[PDB]
Each structure stands twice: as C-alpha cells, then as structure tokens.
Amino acid sequence: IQTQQLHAAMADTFLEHMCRLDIDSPPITARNTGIICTIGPASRSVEILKEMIKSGMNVARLNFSHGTHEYHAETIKNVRAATESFASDPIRYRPVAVALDTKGPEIRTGLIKGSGTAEVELKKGATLKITLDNAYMEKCDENVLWLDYKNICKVVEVGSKVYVDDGLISLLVKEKGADFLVTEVENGGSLGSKKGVNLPGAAVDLPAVSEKDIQDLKFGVEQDVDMVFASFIRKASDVHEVRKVLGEKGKNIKIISKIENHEGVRRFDEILEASDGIMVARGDLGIEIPAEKVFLAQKMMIGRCNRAGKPVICATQMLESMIKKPRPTRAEGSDVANAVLDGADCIMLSGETAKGDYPLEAVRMQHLIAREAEAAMFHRKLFEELVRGSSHSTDLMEAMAMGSVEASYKCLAAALIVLTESGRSAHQVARYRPRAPIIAVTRNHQTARQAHLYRGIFPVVCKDPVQEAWAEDVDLRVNLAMNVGKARGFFKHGDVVIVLTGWRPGSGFTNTMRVVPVP
Amino acid sequence: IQTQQLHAAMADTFLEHMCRLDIDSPPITARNTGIICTIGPASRSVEILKEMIKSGMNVARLNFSHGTHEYHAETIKNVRAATESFASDPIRYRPVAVALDTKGPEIRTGLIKGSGTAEVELKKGATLKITLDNAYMEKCDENVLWLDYKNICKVVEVGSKVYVDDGLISLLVKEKGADFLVTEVENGGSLGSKKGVNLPGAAVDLPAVSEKDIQDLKFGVEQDVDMVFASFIRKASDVHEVRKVLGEKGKNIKIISKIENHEGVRRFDEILEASDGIMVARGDLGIEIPAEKVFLAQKMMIGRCNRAGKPVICATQMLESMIKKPRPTRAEGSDVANAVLDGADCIMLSGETAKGDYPLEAVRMQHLIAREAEAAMFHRKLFEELVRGSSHSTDLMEAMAMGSVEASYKCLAAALIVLTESGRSAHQVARYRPRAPIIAVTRNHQTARQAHLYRGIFPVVCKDPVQEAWAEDVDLRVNLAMNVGKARGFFKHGDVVIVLTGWRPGSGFTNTMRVVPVP
Amino acid sequence: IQTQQLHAAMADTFLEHMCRLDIDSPPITARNTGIICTIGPASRSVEILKEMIKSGMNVARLNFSHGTHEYHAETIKNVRAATESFASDPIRYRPVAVALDTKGPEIRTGLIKGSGTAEVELKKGATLKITLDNAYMEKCDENVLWLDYKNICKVVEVGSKVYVDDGLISLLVKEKGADFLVTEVENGGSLGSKKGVNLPGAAVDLPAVSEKDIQDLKFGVEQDVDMVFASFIRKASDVHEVRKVLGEKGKNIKIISKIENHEGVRRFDEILEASDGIMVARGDLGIEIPAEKVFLAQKMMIGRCNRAGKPVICATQMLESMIKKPRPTRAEGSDVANAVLDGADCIMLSGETAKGDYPLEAVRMQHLIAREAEAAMFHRKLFEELVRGSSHSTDLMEAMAMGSVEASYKCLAAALIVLTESGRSAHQVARYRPRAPIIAVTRNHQTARQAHLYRGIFPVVCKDPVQEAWAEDVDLRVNLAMNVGKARGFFKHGDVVIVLTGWRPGSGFTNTMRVVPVP
C-alpha cells in the first residue's frame, strides 16, 4: 500500500484510476487548494481570526452588499492585527490576503415595518403586490412588498417569476401595473427584510459599477486590498469598467470576475480574457439559470480556466449545513472533494464562517477534504492534457514549468521551491499541476498574499536584507524555504526537492533548475 | 450548437470534454439513472404514490429499522395499488420495484421518559453515563443513557468516541465500568429517543442476520419483494447468510449489499463477487470512516462495480435540505450530478421522501439533474476504458452488447430495443453505457421490476399472449417497444433504432441485431 | 503463449505492443492483403498462371507501356483460361481481377542501332548530346541519344539533371541548343534502348490521356477489365479525363490513380476524392522527388486513404532481388511487412513476376510476410483512431460495420460473412480493419473480382439460382460461405462467426447481424 494515492496514480485509464482509490492511503501534510473565508459577526474577533489563520484560512473576504465602510475598516484592521501577531517568527508567519467582494446590480426587498408580525409567513396561492412607490419602502408585509429596482415593470412580462430570499420564494407575475405588479405567491414561505430578488429571463439594465461600487472600490484601493471579487460580470467591458475605477493606484489589485448569470456564461471567454481569475458564484447562478444546469457551467469554467492558466474559485453553499451543525452532510463532503477534483484553485466558506456557529470546524473540513481530493487527482493524464492544451505556446517559463513539474513527477519531489518577486514564475509551475507543494519565496508582500489564488503555492515572505552577492542572496532564500518546509513538515532532511531560481540578478524568469536533497 | 452535449462528446481529451460543456445543450427526454424512493408517512398515500410514479420513482424502498410488519404490508399494498392503477394502458404502464432495506447490526438509544423535558439538550464538557442496565431503558435523559448493544463495554477503550444521532453527537469514553461507561459530551446537542449509535474503531460482534432479520426477510419473500438492501455487510459470508434465509422461494430476489463500514470497504471485492449489486451507504460509512475519505470509497466502489457489470446505488443525503425547503443547495445539486457522472446506476431519496415536506419536488429534481449529468458523460472514453476492463472475456452477449453500443454511438440511435425475459441480455447492453435508452420488452414481471437496478433500461411489460410464429411474436414485442418509445417521446417515426432479438425461439441470448427506422 | 499475436494485441501502448511481438506466435491461415502480379514473359503461361493463382495471386496487372494489343488480349485470354480451370469446384474457385496499367506521359530513349557495341557503357564526365532530330531515332549511342519528348528543350534549364533507366543514369544539362542539349554524364553506366527518362523539377506539358491512352483504355473496356491503374495523375481533372474515355460502358471499371510525381502528392487530396483508390508508385515517385522523402509520401497516402475508406496499393521493388535470387534481402522483407503494417490494401509484384526467374517464389513470400504483418497490427488502437477519423459521419452501414468489427474483436470471430452484390457493404467492414477474414458472398462477378482491392475480403461467387424465399436464399449463400471457410481452413465446426445480411429482399444495406457458431 503506497501513500498519497500513488497506486491509483499509476493507472493507465481513468476507470482504473477510480478503481484504485484507497481510503487507507494517507495524503501528505500539505494542502494546495486555497480556502477563502467570508468574514462576519461570527469571525471578526482577532482571537477567532488567529484560530482561523492557524486552521488554514488564506484569504479573508469582505462582502460589500452589507456593512458600513467603518465596519469594514475595522474588519481589515483586525484581520491585519491577527496576521501580524505571528509576524514574529518568519518561519511560522503566514500572509493572509484580503478580498473586497463587491455589491453588484443587486435588487433587494424593503424593510418589514410589520414588526408586530412575528414571521411574515407568505402562503401559497395568496396574492402579493409589489410596489416601487417608496412609502411602503419600510412598511413591507405579506400584502405589499417594496423593492430596489425601479425599472422592474419595464423588464418583466405578465407571467414571469420573481425570486426572493435566494429563490426560495417564487412569485408569478399575474398582473402588471404602471409602477407595481400584482403577483401570486407560487412558493409560500416566510419573507424577511432586505432579501435579494432574482429575475431569471429578465433584462436587468442595472450597471456593473454603480456609485456605491465606485466608492467601495476606492475604499478598497485605500485600505490596500489584494484582490477584488466583482459581482455580476456580463461582459469584458464590465471588467474594464471595474479596472478603470481602480486606476494606477489599483494597478496591482487582481480583478476576479464573478460569473453568476447566463450572460457571463455566454460571454465567459471574453470575460476570462479580460480578468485576472474567475469565481463560479453558484448562489445566483443557480437561481439565474436552471439549478440542474449549474454543474455544467462550473466544470466548463474550471476546465477552461485550468486550460488558460487563470485562478478559478468554486463558491457558495459548500458546507452550509455547518452553519448550525458541527459536521457536514454526505452531499457537502462530495461537493468539496469534487471542486478540487474539478481543478478549482480556491474553495470558499461564506455563511459557514460569516455568522455560523462552527466557523473553525468548517475551515478544517474544507482543509481535510481538500487535502484528500488533491491526492485523488489523475496528475499524469491531467498534465498530458494540460501540456496539449498549451501546444501553441513556445514560452520559456512555461517550458521551465512543464519540465520542472515533469521532473517532480519522476523523482517524487517533496516540493518545488520558486524564488519569485512578481509571482509570475511560481504561477506557471502551479498551472501544470505538480503533486508536491510549491514554496514561493518572495520579498514582495502583495505577491505573497495574492499567490493564494493559485493551487499549490505556499507563499513565504523573506524578511532579510538583500545580499551583495546574488548567489548568497539566492541561497539565503533557498534556506528560508527549506527551514519552512521542515518546520511545516512538508519534507525532512534527505528528501528531494526541485529548486527553480534565476541564473543572474536580471534573469527575466526562473531559468535554472536543480534537484537537491533537503539539508 | 448540438443538443444533448454532442459537441463535448467529440473531444479528444477529458479537459476538452469539460471545456465544452454547454448549459444551452438540451438533454434528451429519457432519463437513464434509476431513482429509488424511501417510503414514509409523507408518501404512503396511494394518491401521492401515483404522483411519485408519474414523477419517475422507480423502486419503492422499505426501511425495516422502523415499523411493524403490518405497517409495511399496507405500504406494499398501497404501492401495488398505485402501480396497477395505470395497468390499464400497457403503453403507459410503469412497473415499480419494491425493496426491503434490512435493519442491520444497529445499536440504538433507549426511550427518553424524561418527557417533562422539552428538549434533552446535552451540553459540551458535561458528563453522561451509559447504562446497559435496562431499568433506565425507558428513563433515558441527559444524565443516564441506555442502549441496545449489550457487549459495548467489551468493545470500547477508555478514550474511544461514541456517535449518537448520526454522529452529530460525540462522546468521549472517560471511564469504563463493568456494565456502564462514564462518558463526557464532546459534542453537545439535543438527543432524542431510539437514536442510532456508531462505534468507529470498535469491533462490533453483532451478527449480520439476526432473528429480527430472519423474520423481516421471510416476510420479504412472502410479500414477494424484488430486491433486498442488506445493511452492514462486512464479508462475503454475510451475503451467503442473507441468501440462505431467502432460500429457494427467494431464489430470484436480488441481494444488494450495503457497504457502510470499513471492513466492507476492505473486503469490498469479495462482497461484490458474492452480491447482485452494491449500495454506497454514505450515512454510516461517513461516521464509520473519516468523512473526508468517503468520496474516495464511493468512486472506488462505483468504478469497480461499473467495471464488473454489477448495479451500484449511491445513497443518503443527496437532496436533504429539501426535507424542509423546496429547492436544494448548490452542494446538493453537484452531489447528484456527480454520482451519475461517477457511473451510479441508481440514486436514492430517503428523508426527502419518507417524511419530508417536498416528496415530489425532490423526485423531479433527481430526475432533472440525472437527465443532464447523463448527457455530460464522456461515453467514447468510458466505453473504450470499459471495453479494455473486460479484455479477458470472449463472451458472446458481451460482444453483441459492445457491438450494439458501438453501432448506436455511430448512427446516433434514438434507443436500443432488447427483447428479453430473464433480463441478462438487456443488462449487458446497459453495462457498456450506450447514450440512448434501452427499452427492455419482457413478459416476465420480476424481470421488468428488477431491471430498474441498471442504468438505461426502460422496462416494458408485454401483456399479449404468445404467438405460434416466433417472428410474429418478435414483431409483436418490437412494435410494443416502438409504440411506447413514441408515446414517451423518446423517438418519432423516421428515427433510427438498434434492435436486439433472438434468431429462433431457443437462442440463448440476443444474437441478432438490426438497425431499423421507427415506423 | 497466445497465437496470432493476441498478447501484443492486449497492450496499452504502442511501445508495449512492439515489445510483445513474438516470432513464436503463429498467424492464422487467412491472408487479407491482396497480392497484385505484373504479367510478363515469365508468367504468361496458363500453367504458370494456375500455379500463381494457387499461390495467392489476386489481380493480374497489364503494363501498357509495353506490348501490342494482340499480345495483351492473349494474356487476358490465358489469365481467364487459368482462372476458369478451377471454375468446376465453386468451393475452390477463386476469382482473379485483371488490371490495365496505363502508359502515361512517358518519355523514353530511342533505339541503339549501335548494335556492334556489346554494351553502350557511358562513362563519367563524358559528354553526350541529346537530339530530338529523329534520324538518330534508331541510331542511339554513347555519343548521340534521341528521345520521345519533343518539348524537352523548352522545359529544361542549363544545369538541370536528366534521369535515364530508372534514374540510374544522371546527366547534367551543360549546354542547350534549339533542338538538342549538350549534356555531361554525371553517372556513368551502360544505357539500353527505349529506357525511361525523368525530368525532376521540369514542367512536362505532356497530357495524362493521349491518343495511345485513349486506345488502350477503349481496348480495356472491350476486353472487360476490372480496374485501371492510371499513370502520372497530377490532378482531379486527369481522373475525370480517364473516366470520360471509359464512358458508360466503363461505368464500373474502378479508376486507381497512380501518384508518381510531386504534383500528385501536392494535389493528393483532390485526386483521392476523384479516384476509386490510389497507388503509391514508388518507382517514378522516387526519381521525381528525393528518394529520402518517399517513405513520407507513402505513409501520408496510406494513412489518408485508410482514413477515407479508399483502397491503396503500395508498389514497385518490394522483393526485387528475387528477379535473379530465390530469397529476398533483409531490407525487402521489412519493406513488405511495413506496407501491411502501414495499412496498404494491396501490395504488388512487377519485375519479380513479369520476367524474373522466381515468379512463384516471389508470390509466396509476399503471401508469407503479408500474413505475419497483418497479425502484428495494433487493431484496438487502429480501430479507435479510425472510428475517430470518421466522427462526422452518422452512416448506417458504417455503423453496422463498426459494430460488427467491434463484436468480432470481443468474441474473436473466425471471420465475418457479408452477403453483398454491389460490394459496398463488405467494403465498409474492411475499412474498420477487423482481424478476421471477411468472406464476401456475391452472385455479381465484377464485384467479386474488384473486391480484391480491399484488405480482408475473400470474395466468393455463388453460382446457384435465386430462391423464391429470401430466407432460403440467404441461408443458401451463408452455407456457401461456411463450406468455403471450412474448405480453406479459416474455421472449423464450432467456431464463431459474425454474419451480416439484409433483413428483407430490398434492404439497401447489410442491416442485420448475427453471431453464429460454424456448423
């Protein structure tokens, strides 16, 4: 019995590979998939934030649908407080990225001033009028419901369906007025305040980047966020728009478009081209397009992204039962294993961490599942298919990367060390999917934060001054990477490690490779 | 834009196949994966049972952990009442199978006579003693908990964990007495009566087939059940034991072993050999072995079964949020799409149908998802890999099957018609995974019921007397199969269909194949 | 140790397949590659022609570069005399096809009336003038050489090379006159009369179909030849030209274009489209294009033809040492094994049979080598790659063919029986490369003759009148095919055989398949 699934690793066919999966083949200590946690009331604590960092949280996400800039700054503050409390031991310091998840063309319900009403239980077949007249803006109730979108009457047909509270509630547009819609409760259930509304099949003319958006992003640049999760991207221009607002001072903030509608699925290719990565926002996507179709959209996007060399994040409701329960469902565990198996660079925790009872437990589960699915991949077939996808390129770093990843497969390297500052080089190695961790040593801080988007990169910040002699400088960083790998238990003295570094100070890319045993 | 995913179907690599998945490529009307519904309070109604039949329920499952034989007979009665209400139109009649899901070596909690107590909320760190002394057998409470397993003290070590209510509650065995265990509530939560207990790492000496079991099975033979879902199979003998109880009168009842422990995973191969099919019982398996490992065990078993030609059923918590909600989670939709993609012959609904609010909705969802994942399979690669798995056999029906399935791929047949009585022949075609439905015309009733275990078979019962002339008899059945395919909308006049039939009355197997247009 | 190379047959990789080739794995009695013999002085004898027929000669070729129509008619006469001497036993009768190999835009040397001269040995560096002045038309000698091509001076540049006697002699065009060329003997050697001249890089404006050609072809239609080997095809029009001369009475004569220049390699695709098959005429091709390139041109053409479903014949100098020796060279044996391995439908014997000392020995060698290389093919990989080449077609006979060929692979059929009259159906089976022989039973005579062009078809002529009952008629032919297979030793009672036949009298194609044991 081999370890880390090396037996299934040797199969000639995918079916053989599946038949050979062993639940007694222990994975390796390293976990390559990045976990992104949505920060909320259940996790804003610096204390809980340290526990989350120690549990593998990599990127802290900030949903700007909710909260005041003041509330967010203090979140960024705490997040930074906890990340830096470990800054003391550079060998045990883990940079955590910060992500601004934008509030998109979001339509939401008004306020239910019907406060006497314990639960505004809506019942099947009942009627409910929807008003744009903002006098009931706060007097929402089972009978009259107010909403954001002022051009909704122009967009909907008598007969359309309206989805509130994550499509849980469906309304049939029975009658249409000049500024209201007489609907019928198709799906009864209790509705709350400010719930989100989805108009599948409707042409929402709302803009990608609104005034609110322009302010949240500008606060984003100011608070020096690493990446931006932009909601509702329908086209490549939306991305150029988001980009223009960030300007020069936002020149390095990575824009991750969120495909959560049909248009973005249609226009996917153009979007991917223009973005820095992609997010499969299962939530709205699954209300915008038929829920049965979602898995198709997900695999197409992860495969395409994997093909192009762009990070891709699978999101929403992955371990959701864990908001109230300490263990996920059987369906939830497979959902996570299959996203890693699908090739997702990062997986995400939202309600599970934002306001759930089991923040940390959720984190460790994604960690556990991620570690195991990563071992269950069919690297050989995957790399061949990936090598072939790229056929048209003659790129040198891609060559160093393929070559390095190929060498690691043969000698079963414990990891790959990449000395990088801009991050491009480590990115390329991560793209050809090695089985071993990629320790990325850099003195650039944004680089180390943002390297979390990529599968396999374990970023490490070198806090030592630069050495006069390039070689000394190189070995300085290589020992840093070694002492870390050994402290983290990724490898021990005597193990073999592939090392990618530049020949001379101005090498352009990682053009030298060595196969060295761990000292 | 092709339909039914024919574009992705043409890919040279699995990555290409993934990149080509289109959410605008409508599947076909036929759904090949069999849906198994667990019958409970929410579905015992003949009226709801007709609605469930019209919604695609194929096999009714009866969990013998609960209920009285009297309660079950009436369930079998109603199930039969509803199936036969359609018996009138043989073209629209759908045989529904009945499955006896055995109560295995099940350990359960006592009764909580602590009735004054609204909710016996157990809290973290608290202590709780577990007694075998059956005086508290009904006086269960937060302080004293009684259980089934009388040899539990011999099996556990001080330090072990005990899982109650589907592992939701974990107890640390702090102290051990001669007939009790002083445990500590590791996971606080409200515990109910008769909950199930799991002892991971413990050697439960309970038997596979108990006295209760011997009676439930004998009632099973008597009520003429089609298959048996046997719980907790640890080895090939357990299966021979279950088999021996069924005897000669149970000679045709299909025994499906349920792998829900570690031993059955270990001994899997021996079990598969001895069973008629397998069930991946995610529930207990996920409490018996680390939940992170489960997806491994599932894929290994589905691949291995797919390899051998044995039906395999993926089960438990597939659309569970739908017990209280009308729409599943994003994680649940992928769980179902991935089991079909994994190759599962049948998928199952338990709490979702047994006592859930949305019985029918759950059914149609599995139906929807199943239909779409079936189109997203990589048939070409799958068939090649399957053809290769079989390499060692020179079997003639396997040859007719491979040949037929290959021909269907080329001409894009609307379906495959198989005239079978024993079912063996249609089974072989289903094993090489054609893309088109397999209409199985038979005059045998158990055959048509039990053909649900196999992916792709749409069983049809011929209610006409036998014709003196074999040819006439053959064409009689072939038109039956055609009128059905047309009524169900699987194909229309002019479409092409592959037809497998016997040359002469005593052919042994389906040895003649024709490519005929639909009249 | 398996037989017929079944072990290598099971390999997962081509390298594995090669490593597994066993010289102790006896092939099967049947040989599928068709042997084409060029008839000459050494084989015009009816007696030698029977021996050649008994030795596997399949198609008799008639090179119209040489001979008088009177000489050819008597050859056709003898060929027919010998074929029909076996006509007595229909079970042992073998139809032999007749092929008219056209004299193309052929340039040839004049007559050497320098008869006193024992051998007109030309020596290096010497000079030699080439005259169009036909007074020396017969007075050819080492000093003055006359030739056919009257527009040669317009075509050549001072500096060009002229190739005489199959490029064995090379001349450098040192000086150019108005109607002569002062050349220099680059390659000295003895030159004979009427030798052929090749002008590589020259634009020969000679026509594809000349007056001579128009007469030879019209004699071809008249003598009722089966196929036509048309020399020097440069384009698709040349083929339409050859076709137009055959007219309606030549409507069934198969036109096989001979690619023996660079243009035909360039225009290959257009030619293939327009022809009935192709011939890789290595002789001139190897003087027209650099000899090192030839193997490239050959494999490209055989692969492309194999891809399209068109017969392809590898020709010239395959066993040439056997003109004077009784055993071929080591290089010659591999040349033949590699053409079969390459996928060549037919292989050819020219000088080896035309005027060689060992006519019969040459035949049996091609037979021996062919039989063994056919076993060394990688059918599995070949069929998959072939199935994929065809992807775009949904053709029903192609489906029956793929399906049949797939079934034969699984059950290891001893042969495939195809009841055909027009031959189309058997052709399709042969195209997906089964491992077993394809016995083609037909009552059509041209069909049975011309079925030799295709790899695997063992044509059989049914000489029985038609039966009133289609079924009886079908079984009549199937037993014919069985008694033949048994007489030829291809299979014995108890062996399995795939049988392709039409359902009813007017089936359109072979749409019914059965797997039957040999009676």
- Within 8 A of A366 by CB-CB distance, chain B residues are none
Q: How far is B184 from chain A (nearest CA, A)?
A: 17
Cβ neighbors of B332 (< 8 A, separation 6 or more) are A329, A331, A332, A335, B318, B319, B320, B321, B322
Sort strands C161-164 and C169-176 into parallel, antiparallel or unpaired.
antiparallel
When computed from its CA atoms, the radius of gyration of chain B, rounded to whole angstroms, is 24
* Residue A220 touches partner B, C-beta closer than 8 Å: no
Distance CA C184, CA C188 (A): 10
Cβ neighbors of B321 (< 8 A, separation 6 or more) are A321, B328, B329, B332
Alpha-carbon distances, residue C310 vs A507, B367, C235, C348, C395 (angstroms): 55, 46, 17, 17, 16
C-facing residues of B in 5-34 (CB < 8 A) are: 10, 12
- Neighbouring CB atoms inside 10 A of C21's CB total 13
Residues A270, A179: one domain?
Answer: no
* Residue C515 touches partner B, C-beta closer than 8 Å: yes
**DSSP 8-state class, residue C182:** E
**DSSP 8-state class, residue A518:** -
Contact B277, B285 (CB under 8 A): no
Residue in A with minimal Cα distance to B13:
A385
Out of A21, A295, A371, the one facing B333 most closely (by C-beta) is A295
Backbone angles phi, psi at A218, to 5 degrees: -65, -30
Contact: B402, C410; criterion CB under 8 Å = yes
**DSSP alpha helices (H): ranges in B41-116?**
46-54, 69-84
Distance CA B85, CA B73 (A): 18
Q: Is B167 exposed, middle or buried (0-12, 13-18, 19+ CB in 10 A)?
A: buried
Maximum C-alpha span of chain C: 79
Distance CA A56, CA B150 (A): 42
Out of C12, C384, C511, the one facing B515 most closely (by C-beta) is C511
Contact: A15, B389; criterion CB under 8 Å = yes
Residues C219, C273: one domain?
Answer: yes
* Residue B384 touches partner C, C-beta closer than 8 Å: yes
Amino acid (one-letter) located at A192: G
**DSSP alpha helices (H): ranges in C258-358?**
263-266, 268-274, 282-288, 294-308, 330-342, 351-354
Distance CA A226, CA C482 (A): 78
Q: How far is B11 from chain C (nearest CA, A)?
A: 10
- DSSP readout, B406-474? HHHHHHT-S-EEEE-SSSHHHHHHHHT--SS-EEEEES-HHHHHHGGGSTTEEEEE--SPPPSSHHHHH
* Residue B364 touches partner A, C-beta closer than 8 Å: no
Distance CA A420, CA A404 (A): 15
- Within 8 A of C515 by CB-CB distance, chain B residues are 396, 399-400, 511
Question: Which of B498, B501, B513 is the best substitution to test chain C (most C C-beta atoms within 10 A)?
Answer: B513
Smallest Cα–Cα separation from B40: which of B366, B349, B493?
B349
Contact: C400, B515; criterion CB under 8 Å = yes
Distance CA B108, CA B106 (A): 6
Sheet bearing C169-176, strands edge to edge: C107-108, C196-198, C161-164, C169-176, C180-185, C127-131, C144-146
**DSSP alpha helices (H): ranges in B85-166?**
152-155
Residues A77, A117: one domain?
Answer: no
Contact B49, B43 (CB under 8 A): yes
Q: What kind and span of H or E run contains B384?
A: helix B379-390
- Neighbouring CB atoms inside 10 A of A171's CB total 23
B-facing residues of A in 228-247 (CB < 8 A) are: none
Contact A258, A229 (CB under 8 A): yes
Distance CA C179, CA C199 (A): 16
Residues A309, A327: one domain?
Answer: yes
Lookup result for tokens 């189309």: C424
Exposure string of B41-57, with b = 16+ CB inside 10 Å and e = fewer, is ebbbeeebbbbbbebbb
Residue in A with minimal Cα distance to B285:
A330
Residue in C with minimal Cα distance to B405:
C403
Contact: B514, C511; criterion CB under 8 Å = yes
Question: Domain tally for chain A?
Answer: 3
- Neighbouring CB atoms inside 10 A of B158's CB total 12
- Within 8 A of A294 by CB-CB distance, chain B residues are 330, 333-334
Token pair in block for residue C508: 């359109």
Query: How many CB pairs lie under 8 A apart between chains B and C?
Result: 83
Contact A153, A178 (CB under 8 A): yes
The separation between CA A492 and the C-alpha centre of its own chain, rounded to angstroms, equals 31
**DSSP 8-state class, residue C6:** H
Smallest Cα–Cα separation from B389: which of C422, A442, C410?
C410
End-to-end CA distance of chain A: 28
**DSSP 8-state class, residue A505:** T
Angle at which helix A359-375 crosses helix B294-308, to 10 degrees, equals 40
Backbone angles phi, psi at B500, to 5 degrees: -105, 120
Residue in C with minimal Cα distance to B403:
C403
When computed from its CA atoms, the radius of gyration of chain C, rounded to whole angstroms, is 24
Residues C133, C212: one domain?
Answer: no
- Of C170, C191, C207, the position where a domain reaches its end is C207
Q: A33, A38, A183, A316: which is the annotated catalytic residue?
A: A316
Angle at which helix C236-246 crosses helix C211-222, to 10 degrees, equals 50
Alpha-carbon distances, residue C440 vs C449, C452, C458, C478 (angstroms): 11, 10, 6, 10
Contact B192, B183 (CB under 8 A): no
Contact B159, B172 (CB under 8 A): yes
Alpha-carbon distances, residue B136 vs B110, B133, B170, B188, B190 (angstroms): 8, 7, 21, 21, 18
Smallest Cα–Cα separation from A427: which of A400, A405, A457, A448?
A457
- Of B327, B342, B373, the position where a domain reaches its end is B373
Amino acid (one-letter) located at C81: A
- Of B177, B207, B237, the position where a domain reaches its end is B207
Cβ neighbors of C452 (< 8 A, separation 6 or more) are C34, C58, C59, C97, C346, C459
Contact: A289, B382; criterion CB under 8 Å = no
Tell me the structure's resolution in angstroms, rounded to a single decimal.
2.6
Beta strand extents in A140-233 (DSSP E only): 144-146, 161-164, 169-176, 180-185, 189-190, 196-198, 227-230
Distance CA B30, CA B372 (A): 10
Out of A330, A376, A385, the one facing B317 most closely (by C-beta) is A330
Residues A230, A83: one domain?
Answer: yes
Q: What kind and span of H or E run contains A430?
A: helix A424-431
Token pair in block for residue C366: 């091609």
Distance CA C335, CA B100 (A): 67
Residues B369, B382: one domain?
Answer: no
Q: Is C485 exposed, middle or buried (0-12, 13-18, 19+ CB in 10 A)?
A: buried
CATH of the domain at A54: 3.20.20.60
Lookup result for tokens 């100070």: A505
- Within 8 A of B10 by CB-CB distance, chain C residues are 391
Distance CA A48, CA C512 (A): 72
* Residue B393 touches partner C, C-beta closer than 8 Å: yes
Cβ neighbors of A508 (< 8 A, separation 6 or more) are A502
Smallest Cα–Cα separation from C286: which of C321, C320, C256, C259?
C259
- Neighbouring CB atoms inside 10 A of B391's CB total 11
Contact C52, C359 (CB under 8 A): yes
Backbone angles phi, psi at C274, to 5 degrees: -75, -20
Question: Which of C410, C431, C435 is the best substitution to test chain B (most B C-beta atoms within 10 A)?
Answer: C410
The separation between CA B236 and the C-alpha centre of its own chain, rounded to angstroms, equals 20
- Within 8 A of A388 by CB-CB distance, chain B residues are 13
Annotated binding site of B for ATP: 63-66, 108, 195
The separation between CA A361 and the C-alpha centre of its own chain, rounded to angstroms, equals 19
Question: Which of B14, B269, B334 is the best substitution to test chain A (most A C-beta atoms within 10 A)?
Answer: B334
Distance CA C362, CA C322 (A): 6
Distance CA B305, CA B312 (A): 6
CATH of the domain at C194: 2.40.33.10
Residue in C with minimal Cα distance to B412:
C394
SS3 label, residue A237: helix
Amino acid (one-letter) located at A42: A
Q: A31, A33, A38, A61: which is the annotated catalytic residue?
A: A61
End-to-end CA distance of chain C: 28
Contact B312, B278 (CB under 8 A): yes
Alpha-carbon distances, residue A253 vs A220, A225, A248, A277, A450 (angstroms): 9, 7, 10, 12, 9
A92 is known as an active-site residue: no
Q: How far is B177 from chain C (nearest CA, A)?
A: 60
Q: What kind and span of H or E run contains B94?
A: none
Contact: C402, B407; criterion CB under 8 Å = yes
Catalytic amino acids of B?
61, 108, 258, 316
Distance CA C500, CA C401 (A): 9
- DSSP readout, B464-504? SPPPSSHHHHHHHHHHHHHHHHHHTTS--TT-EEEEEE-SS
Lookup result for tokens 């705490």: A78
Cβ neighbors of B122 (< 8 A, separation 6 or more) are B128, B142, B169, B185, B188, B189, B190, B191
Residues B59, B99: one domain?
Answer: yes
* Residue A325 touches partner B, C-beta closer than 8 Å: yes
Per residue, what are the HEC states of A22-58?
Answer: CCCCCCCCCCCCEEEEECCCCCCCHHHHHHHHHCCEE
Sort strands C312-315 and C277-281 into parallel, antiparallel or unpaired.
parallel
Contact A330, B42 (CB under 8 A): no
The residues that bridge with A61 in the sheet, in sequence order, are A38, A99
CATH of the domain at A391: 3.40.1380.20
Contact B344, B302 (CB under 8 A): yes
Angle at which helix C396-411 crosses helix B396-411, to 10 degrees, equals 160
Token pair in block for residue A353: 């961490």
- Within 8 A of A389 by CB-CB distance, chain B residues are 13, 15-16
Residues B148, B269: one domain?
Answer: no
Distance CA A96, CA A226 (A): 10
Backbone angles phi, psi at A143, to 5 degrees: -95, -35
Alpha-carbon distances, residue C143 vs C110, C114, C146, C148 (angstroms): 13, 10, 10, 17
How was this one solved?
X-ray
Angle at C170 between CA C164 and CA C171, to 5 degrees: 100
Sign of the four-CA dihedral C292, C295, C296, C297: positive
* Residue C503 touches partner B, C-beta closer than 8 Å: yes
Exposure string of C362-397, with b = 16+ CB inside 10 Å and e = fewer, is bbebbbbbbbbbbbbbbbbeebeebbeebeeeeebb
Alpha-carbon distances, residue C323 vs A444, C230, C318, C326 (angstroms): 79, 25, 11, 8
SS3 label, residue C2: coil
Smallest Cα–Cα separation from A314: which of A300, A330, A325, A298?
A298
Residues C152, C250: one domain?
Answer: no
Residue in C with minimal Cα distance to B9:
C391
Smallest Cα–Cα separation from C298: which of C313, C308, C309?
C313
Token pair in block for residue B94: 């759908």
Q: What kind and span of H or E run contains A363?
A: helix A359-375
Amino acid (one-letter) located at A190: S
Residue in C with minimal Cα distance to B396:
C411
Out of B394, B399, B407, the one facing C399 most closely (by C-beta) is B407
Q: Tabulate helix, strand, coil % of chain A (nearest 5).
A: 40, 20, 40
* Residue A306 touches partner B, C-beta closer than 8 Å: yes
Token pair in block for residue C4: 């017929």
Angle at B207 between CA B206 and CA B210, to 5 degrees: 115
Distance CA B461, CA A61 (A): 58
- DSSP readout, C45-86? -HHHHHHHHHTTEEEEEEETTSS-HHHHHHHHHHHHHHHHTT
**DSSP 8-state class, residue C112:** B
Angle at A318 between CA A315 and CA A322, to 5 degrees: 135
Token pair in block for residue B428: 């072989």
Contact A306, A313 (CB under 8 A): no
C258 is known as an active-site residue: yes
Residues C368, C272: one domain?
Answer: yes
Residues B140, B100: one domain?
Answer: no
Question: Which of B17, B18, B187 is the best substitution to test chain A (most A C-beta atoms within 10 A)?
Answer: B18
Q: Tabulate helix, strand, coil % of chain C (nearest 5).
A: 40, 20, 40
The residues that bridge with A101 in the sheet, in sequence order, are A63, A229
- Neighbouring CB atoms inside 10 A of C499's CB total 25
- DSSP readout, A317-341? SSSGGGGT-SS--HHHHHHHHHHHH
**DSSP alpha helices (H): ranges in A173-293?**
211-222, 236-246, 263-266, 268-274, 282-288
Token pair in block for residue B68: 């009285």
Out of C395, C406, C515, the one facing B406 most closely (by C-beta) is C406
Counting every residue written for chain A, the total comes to 519
Q: How far is C406 from chain B (nearest CA, A)?
A: 5
- Domain enclosing residue A487, as ranges: 1-30+374-519
When computed from its CA atoms, the radius of gyration of chain A, rounded to whole angstroms, is 24
